[PDB]
Scaffold this active site. Structure first.
Site, PDB file in Angstrom:
ATOM      1  N   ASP A 195      -1.477  -6.103   8.460  1.00 11.81           N
ATOM      2  CA  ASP A 195      -0.414  -6.882   7.791  1.00 11.81           C
ATOM      3  C   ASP A 195       1.025  -6.452   8.035  1.00 11.81           C
ATOM      4  O   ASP A 195       1.939  -7.088   7.501  1.00 11.81           O
ATOM      5  CB  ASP A 195      -0.656  -6.922   6.258  1.00 11.81           C
ATOM      6  CG  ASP A 195      -0.049  -8.173   5.574  1.00 11.81           C
ATOM      7  OD1 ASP A 195       0.036  -9.241   6.223  1.00 11.81           O
ATOM      8  OD2 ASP A 195       0.322  -8.105   4.374  1.00 11.81           O
ATOM      9  N   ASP A 226      -8.061  -3.501  -8.919  1.00 11.67           N
ATOM     10  CA  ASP A 226      -8.410  -2.891  -7.632  1.00 11.67           C
ATOM     11  C   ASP A 226      -9.889  -2.690  -7.635  1.00 11.67           C
ATOM     12  O   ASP A 226     -10.423  -2.203  -8.636  1.00 11.67           O
ATOM     13  CB  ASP A 226      -7.786  -1.498  -7.482  1.00 11.67           C
ATOM     14  CG  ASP A 226      -6.293  -1.541  -7.607  1.00 11.67           C
ATOM     15  OD1 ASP A 226      -5.690  -2.484  -7.034  1.00 11.67           O
ATOM     16  OD2 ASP A 226      -5.751  -0.644  -8.276  1.00 11.67           O
ATOM     17  N   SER A 243      -3.645  -7.413 -12.353  1.00  9.56           N
ATOM     18  CA  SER A 243      -4.534  -7.525 -11.198  1.00  9.56           C
ATOM     19  C   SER A 243      -5.513  -6.343 -11.323  1.00  9.56           C
ATOM     20  O   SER A 243      -5.332  -5.491 -12.154  1.00  9.56           O
ATOM     21  CB  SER A 243      -3.761  -7.398  -9.864  1.00  9.56           C
ATOM     22  OG  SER A 243      -3.090  -6.154  -9.759  1.00  9.56           O
ATOM     23  N   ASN A 255      -4.552  -2.923 -12.884  1.00 10.20           N
ATOM     24  CA  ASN A 255      -3.195  -2.505 -12.584  1.00 10.20           C
ATOM     25  C   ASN A 255      -2.296  -2.963 -13.699  1.00 10.20           C
ATOM     26  O   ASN A 255      -2.645  -3.830 -14.501  1.00 10.20           O
ATOM     27  CB  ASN A 255      -2.706  -3.106 -11.264  1.00 10.20           C
ATOM     28  CG  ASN A 255      -3.575  -2.707 -10.096  1.00 10.20           C
ATOM     29  OD1 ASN A 255      -3.773  -1.522  -9.859  1.00 10.20           O
ATOM     30  ND2 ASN A 255      -4.113  -3.692  -9.365  1.00 10.20           N
ATOM     31  N   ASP A 299      -0.054  -5.005 -13.959  1.00 10.69           N
ATOM     32  CA  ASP A 299       0.347  -6.401 -13.738  1.00 10.69           C
ATOM     33  C   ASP A 299      -0.763  -7.373 -13.997  1.00 10.69           C
ATOM     34  O   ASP A 299      -0.573  -8.580 -13.847  1.00 10.69           O
ATOM     35  CB  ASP A 299       0.911  -6.642 -12.321  1.00 10.69           C
ATOM     36  CG  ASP A 299      -0.142  -6.555 -11.222  1.00 10.69           C
ATOM     37  OD1 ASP A 299      -1.352  -6.430 -11.542  1.00 10.69           O
ATOM     38  OD2 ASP A 299       0.265  -6.619 -10.030  1.00 10.69           O
ATOM     39  N   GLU A 341      -8.724   7.090  -3.791  1.00  9.10           N
ATOM     40  CA  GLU A 341      -8.730   5.748  -4.406  1.00  9.10           C
ATOM     41  C   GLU A 341      -9.954   5.530  -5.330  1.00  9.10           C
ATOM     42  O   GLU A 341      -9.858   4.998  -6.453  1.00  9.10           O
ATOM     43  CB  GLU A 341      -8.771   4.675  -3.292  1.00  9.10           C
ATOM     44  CG  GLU A 341      -7.442   4.501  -2.403  1.00  9.10           C
ATOM     45  CD  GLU A 341      -6.200   3.965  -3.153  1.00  9.10           C
ATOM     46  OE1 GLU A 341      -6.325   3.702  -4.373  1.00  9.10           O
ATOM     47  OE2 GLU A 341      -5.088   3.855  -2.529  1.00  9.10           O
ATOM     48  N   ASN A 353      -6.753  -4.849  -4.022  1.00  7.83           N
ATOM     49  CA  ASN A 353      -6.179  -5.601  -5.112  1.00  7.83           C
ATOM     50  C   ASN A 353      -6.421  -7.120  -5.164  1.00  7.83           C
ATOM     51  O   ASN A 353      -6.376  -7.833  -4.145  1.00  7.83           O
ATOM     52  CB  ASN A 353      -4.669  -5.300  -5.095  1.00  7.83           C
ATOM     53  CG  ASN A 353      -4.028  -5.342  -6.450  1.00  7.83           C
ATOM     54  OD1 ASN A 353      -3.248  -4.441  -6.811  1.00  7.83           O
ATOM     55  ND2 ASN A 353      -4.293  -6.387  -7.200  1.00  7.83           N
TER      56      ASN A 353
END
Ligand SMILES: [Cl-]
Ligand SMILES: [Cl-]
Ligand code: NA
Length: 129
Positions: free
Chosen positions: A101, A52, A50, A46, A48, A35, A59
């Site tokens: 989650d 990281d 967003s 990203n 979209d 990562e 994110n």
């Protein structure tokens, strides 16, 4: 800060990731590697909009506030910049919330793709813990 592999394994354990939600330390170390290359300051946008952040590339769409991800949430209740600190406490705590989650580490696509199903113990092999 860029951690050494064994250096990161010890800090993650000291911070409690060891077998957290059943994920052994090697899974976490492996994920961190792919990562962020173990670099707390890593960021990537990203597609979209967003972004990281940190050693586990958490994110802003869901987990932290960076002020420029419209319609996003801040489930970890932290500014995204805290995830870039030499002090991995916010990244670790937010990671524990994410893995809890319901989808476990599958939340980290790079864990699913480069660690899951492999011999992750190799990531902590040699390390004094
Ligand atoms: Cl935002
Ligand atoms: Cl799980
Ligand atoms: Na956000």
């Amino acid at each position: 800060k860029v951690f050494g592999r064994c250096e990161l394994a010890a800090a993650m354990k000291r911070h409690g990731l060891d077998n957290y939600r059943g994920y052994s330390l090697g899974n976490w170390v492996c994920a961190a590697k792919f990562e962020s290359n173990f670099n707390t300051q890593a960021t990537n946008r990203n597609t979209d909009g967003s972004t990281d952040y940190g050693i586990l590339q958490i994110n802003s769409r869901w987990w932290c506030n960076d002020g420029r991800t419209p319609g996003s949430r801040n489930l970890c209740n932290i500014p995204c910049s805290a995830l870039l600190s030499s002090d991995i406490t916010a990244s670790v705590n937010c990671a524990k919330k994410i893995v809890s989650d319901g989808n476990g580490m599958n939340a980290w696509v790079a864990w699913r793709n480069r660690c899951k199903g492999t011999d992750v113990q190799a990531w902590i092999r040699g390390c004094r813990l």
